[PDB]
Amino acid sequence: EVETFAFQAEIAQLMSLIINTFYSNKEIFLRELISNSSDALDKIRYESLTDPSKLDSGKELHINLIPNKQDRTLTIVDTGIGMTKADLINNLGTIAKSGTKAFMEALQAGADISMIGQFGVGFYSAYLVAEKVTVITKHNDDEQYAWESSAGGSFTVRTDTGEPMGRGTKVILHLKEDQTEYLEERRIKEIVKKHSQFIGYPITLFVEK
Template sequence: MAPVLSRILASASLIPLPSSSPLVLQKTHNKVLNSRISFCPPNGVPRNWPKCNIGKKFHRRRPTKLSVRCDAAVVDQEAPEASGEKYEYQAEVSRLLDLIVHSLYSHKEVFLRELVSNASDALDKLRFLSVTEPSLLGDAGELEIRIKPDPDNGTITITDTGIGMTKEELIDCLGTIAQSGTSKFLKALKENKDLGADNGLIGQFGVGFYSAFLVAERVVVSTKSPRSDKQYVWEAVADSSSYAIREETDPEKLLKRGTQVTLYLRPDDKYEFSDPTRIQNLVKNYSQFVSFPIYVWQEKSRTVEVEEEEEPKEGDEKPEGEKKKKKKKKTVTEKYWDWELANETKPIWMRNP
């Protein structure tokens, strides 16, 4: 007797989740094949065999859902907000600022690159805005950056003739960590397509200025905006959680336009970063291709001729009424201080062929 073979294809059903659950993967089978095949010997069915169907039978089944379930799917609704009083996070600003500065910069010397970049951005802003407001330029001179190291007092001063800042901008930009005036300016430029946006603007994160505290124990910022009649001074000390702003009243310290940043260097850094030669090399390394001229206060030497009075010899003595000293010229080396252009080398793509 030939055996009877049967084969059944069916899909196993799992416990379905609600259709609204975000973690249910649903797949509907339009057709499920249920095939039952039976064979009988050609000479008939024995009496002791159960009756069987000869042929194939196909029928449709109702669509089923293939569900995938995990523990997180048991919650259909979002968790409600925590009840009770709400409080804002508190932070020790001085400690937070120290962490930000020292985690972003591994070398102290990059402070100069950041401050020069800020000065370049201020000049760029003035140049853009002067297209529609020529009066902003005034008579404050050329667009330039000047760096003056002072070895005697252990300071370094970076001055630009850029757009400057008002009192409100000082509070907004320097009084708020990670608040970038450049990023706001870029956003305004994108909204006003007549001016166009310049990708050369660098300071978009609002922390570059604070790199000054890598080498300085006190920072003083004096700034004058062409849109304001007053000049303001921002001052802060390292490891402090506060700063001070006052109006500048000393006539000798007034600026026509722009910003002046003075760093009072730490004892361990004053000899290195108040050295004019060191500053000159840093400008060439980090800011060589800034589009505005950068001048560094340098000690120079020159050869000059001076007259020296020569005492008469013993044999050449004349009567007292006729005695005169002879004058002799000699060459000496004289030292003096003057501004020197530090970024005179232009990038290859800007040079004349």
């Protein structure tokens, strides 16, 4: 059973701006997603100090980068706190409304798209390089869900029947045809070294078989 939702108008407008604006410095999408993963890992680490059972779903706190040239996907996996169904459908987009407005006004005033993370809506920078984004997520207090959107004003949410993840989030970037450089090991290494060198969790870049 698949549920289809409309983005709020302001978020759809943000997504269109990211997709349509000419802006060559697309590589910053990875910094934003890794920063998001680091934030989710910080949250489960903090919560597990006052409740160690919150790590019964997995003790390891890490980030994995998995390219797949056959599927033309780049997957960012973390074992952070995960997201509830309410997070996916309503809470996070509601919060993003204010950051989107502030980001819009900053852009009109001289800012550029690389500053998106200073406004708290860095997830949507995924559409700099992806034609479709799939988010698989598992929070301790909810079931495993799959969120998905190719923009165009709508997204879907369904219960995920695939491999159980334990806890955390996978962001699967279905890359645009002209953005396959982000599947190359040397290119991902360069970007992580440039923009994510001090992330406080191990980042493992998987190799293709």
